[PDB]
Amino acid sequence: SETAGKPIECKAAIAWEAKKPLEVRTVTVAPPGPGEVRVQIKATALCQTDAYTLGGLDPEGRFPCILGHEAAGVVESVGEGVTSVKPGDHVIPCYQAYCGECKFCKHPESNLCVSVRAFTGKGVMKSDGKPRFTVDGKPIYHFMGTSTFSEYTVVHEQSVAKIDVNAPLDKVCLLGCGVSTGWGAVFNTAKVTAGSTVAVFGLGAVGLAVIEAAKRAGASRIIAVDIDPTKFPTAKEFGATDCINPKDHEKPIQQVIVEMTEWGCDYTFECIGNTAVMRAALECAHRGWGTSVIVGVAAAGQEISTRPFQLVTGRRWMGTAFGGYKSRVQVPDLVTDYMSGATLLDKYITHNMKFDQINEAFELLHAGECLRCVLTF
């Protein structure tokens, strides 16, 4: 290789501080240490989670840092000990790691690996406790263990899903977070049964993925809820049978849903990050057995509340992280399902832009005018 074992200077987008636009400039990327993989990002999308940390809403937010966590790329080089990937492998770096040996990797119902979170949560690497990015010798920190807003990033081996080398990297970049989360919320967390009724709160890429998955699960009714009705036509494309704007009703939205379904929907999904809506989604879960799945990420500190009578009379409050998918094991399975022609993944990409316009993409998502914006270098 031409770059293996040596630093790489490449284009990236740095967040020097919160609530400021990113600076697209050159950074230096160190070679991978033991158990690490240096990846050449080929495509990367913006998620609402990136704007969440950029807006100062992350308690563990550490600046300066390279954001980004929805990407697909090619292995440029690996550090010593790395056996699972090799240069040339097509990969998807995942915020959720997989070690196969911790208690959560071994449990059938969890994907919350603890192999590297103590370091990825701090924006550093496990091998030496430091980051791999510098600018004029000063350290720039990692984000969600991925930091995909850079031509080359360095990640832990446990965070690297090896995927079908023939899958288009600018489409499956979405499988690193949002769309996978919405799908697994249906298939893994809720396990929607055929015939069921569903309510989805928030119609971004995540909520639309809940709708697509619930459709595929055989749901007989899917109520799409959003305060922005310009997202309704796409929601009906994915399979929504009803679209509801909360601002068209003086009743609370959970009362509206209950009246449409007498007792509530068998499953409800919150895909916003609004604690008042999370409460609403649980209270319009069906009496006796309804399930509500929190998908959105609320601002740190905020609390959800309900009357305990809601759970005593049969409703179930749960949440999901990355759809319950064990990353390195199951992300390749999602790529395989994409390559089989069975998904609507291509429909989630509303804009393809160059990496230099990353800030316009952030304005697109703050304005609700995009689903997923895929950046290429």
Ligand X SMILES: NC(=O)c1ccc[n+]([C@@H]2O[C@H](COP(=O)([O-])OP(=O)(O)OC[C@H]3O[C@@H](n4cnc5c(N)ncnc54)[C@H](O)[C@@H]3O)[C@@H](O)[C@H]2O)c1
Amino acid identity, residue 111?
Answer: N
Instruction: Determine, following the binding rule CB under 8 A, whether residue 122 of this chain makes contact with a copy of itself.
Output: no
Q: Which does 181 bind (CB under 5 to 8 A by kind): Zn ion, ligand X, a copy of itself, none?
A: ligand X
Instruction: Determine, following the binding rule CB under 8 A, whether residue 320 of this chain makes contact with a copy of itself.
Output: yes
Instruction: Determine, following the binding rule CB under 5 A, whether residue 47 of this chain makes contact with Zn ion.
Output: yes
CB 173 within 8 A of CB 71: yes
Near ligand X in 160-179, by CB under 6 A = 177-178
Residue 304 CB, nearest distance to a copy of itself (Å)? 5
Burial category of 178 from C-beta neighbours within 10 Å (exposed 0-12, middle 13-18, buried 19 and up): buried
Residue 262 CB, nearest distance to a copy of itself (Å)? 8
Query: How far is residue 202 from each of residues 196, 273, 303, measured CA to CA in Å?
Result: 19, 9, 19
Near ligand X in 102-131, by CB under 6 A = none
Residue 58 CB, nearest distance to Cl ion (Å)? 10
Per-position x/- string for 323-342, each x denoting binding to a copy of itself as judged by CB under 8 A, each - no binding: --------------------
Closest CA to 281 of 223, 339, 236: 223
Q: Of the candidates 116, 203, 293, 373, which one interacts with ligand X according to CB under 6 A?
A: 203
Closest CA to 234 of 94, 37, 368, 85: 368
CB proximity list for 289: less than 8 A, separation 6 or greater: 266, 314, 315, 316
Across 348-375, b (16+ Cβ under 10 Å) vs e yields bbebebebeebeebbebbeeeebbbbbb
Residue 300 CB, nearest distance to Cl ion (Å)? 4
Instruction: Determine, following the binding rule CB under 5 A, whether residue 95 of this chain makes contact with Mg ion.
Output: yes
Give the per-residue SS3 of 350-363: EEEEEHHHHHHHHH
Closest CA to 153 of 137, 136, 168, 140: 140
Cis peptide before 64 (omega within 30 of 0): yes
On whether 271 is known to bind a ligand per the annotation, the reply is no
What is the SS3 assignment for 32? coil
Q: Of the candidates 288, 329, 346, 366, which one interacts with a copy of itself according to CB under 8 A?
A: 288
Q: Of the candidates 34, 84, 87, 104, which one interacts with a copy of itself according to CB under 8 A?
A: 104
Computed from CA positions of residues 89, 92, 93, 99, in that sequence, does the dihedral angle turn out positive or negative? Answer: negative
Bind-site residues for Zn(2+): 47, 69-70, 99, 102, 105, 113, 177
Bind-site residues for NAD(+): 48, 95, 205-206, 226, 231, 272, 274, 295, 297, 320, 322, 372
Task: Catalog residues that contact Cl ion under the rule CB under 5 A.
Answer: 300, 307, 309, 343
Task: Catalog residues that contact a copy of itself under the rule CB under 8 A.
Answer: 103-104, 107, 109-112, 263, 275, 278, 287-289, 294-295, 297-298, 301-321
Task: Catalog residues that contact ligand X under the rule CB under 6 A.
Answer: 47-49, 52, 177-178, 181, 201-207, 225-228, 231, 246, 271-274, 277, 295-297, 312, 320-322, 365, 368
